[PDB]
Subunit: 152 residues, 2 copies
């Protein structure tokens, strides 16, 4: 992705709290295919640290259960771009947010071949307005998504 | 679906031959989730019978293999609507086709609760034009699809 597609002026402390994953899409079918795909994860809460890093509480399906995992995405020199500094590196990119209703972000796999990207549309509450979904749709018009999922 | 969303004047004998499944979508995530979902099937060939019924050659993933299955969709009193008269009933609905490039169709599960529908965009050859994909997109604007997949 380029620096111009990510968020300008993000204040990471205002995204703190609970979120729900409303929709997802990925550049490759295999990124989100079955319940066990590594990027099929549901965000539960974002917890910025006082140092500016981002702790991510996620739910993933593992063995017929709903497991919880905590990952830390560290700030980088690029605002809105966070790095999960694991054995397999991943970047978290914040595309846009209004802090009080929706947050759009993508997880990128650089270690992989071309551009394995999976993006999500997060909402603060399960309210019935589709502003978040329209913005997600519009933010993904520039990317090659081959699988798109929407939750109920 | 209603009688007005299906094809008028279909000549089933002109759809005979090989096709490739280019894209799929379904009203429920679970209809197409993993490789083993019952409606995640890839069309290989359509073979109309002299009596006006439609034999469908499909490929499905079963146990780490690519299995072939043959199902017969029988004509009904409604043109473009075929019934798979199995223990679990399914209807096949032809939405549109130009016979020489693309064919759009949906498989419906009436026995299920609300409206479990899965639709596909078929093409004659893997050529690089997106007319079929635009028509599929446009035909699905009226339905509530929660999962959409596109093949490479």
């Amino acid at each position: 992705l380029i620096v111009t597609q990510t968020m300008k002026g993000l204040d990471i402390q205002k995204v703190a709290g609970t979120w729900y994953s409303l929709a997802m899409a990925a550049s490759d079918i295999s990124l989100l295919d079955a319940q066990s795909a590594p990027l099929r994860v549901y965000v539960e809460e974002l917890k910025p640290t006082p140092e500016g890093d981002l702790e991510i509480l996620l739910q993933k399906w593992e063995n017929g259960e709903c497991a919880q995992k905590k990952i830390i995405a560290e700030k980088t020199k690029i605002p809105a771009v966070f790095k999960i500094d694991a054995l397999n590196e991943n970047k978290v990119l914040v595309l846009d947010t209004d802090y009080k209703k929706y947050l759009l972000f993508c997880m990128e796999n650089s270690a992989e071949p071309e551009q394995s990207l999976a993006c999500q549309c997060l909402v603060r509450t399960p309210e019935v307005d589709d502003e978040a979904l329209e913005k997600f749709d519009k933010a993904l018009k520039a990317l090659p998504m081959h699988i798109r999922l929407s939750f109920n």
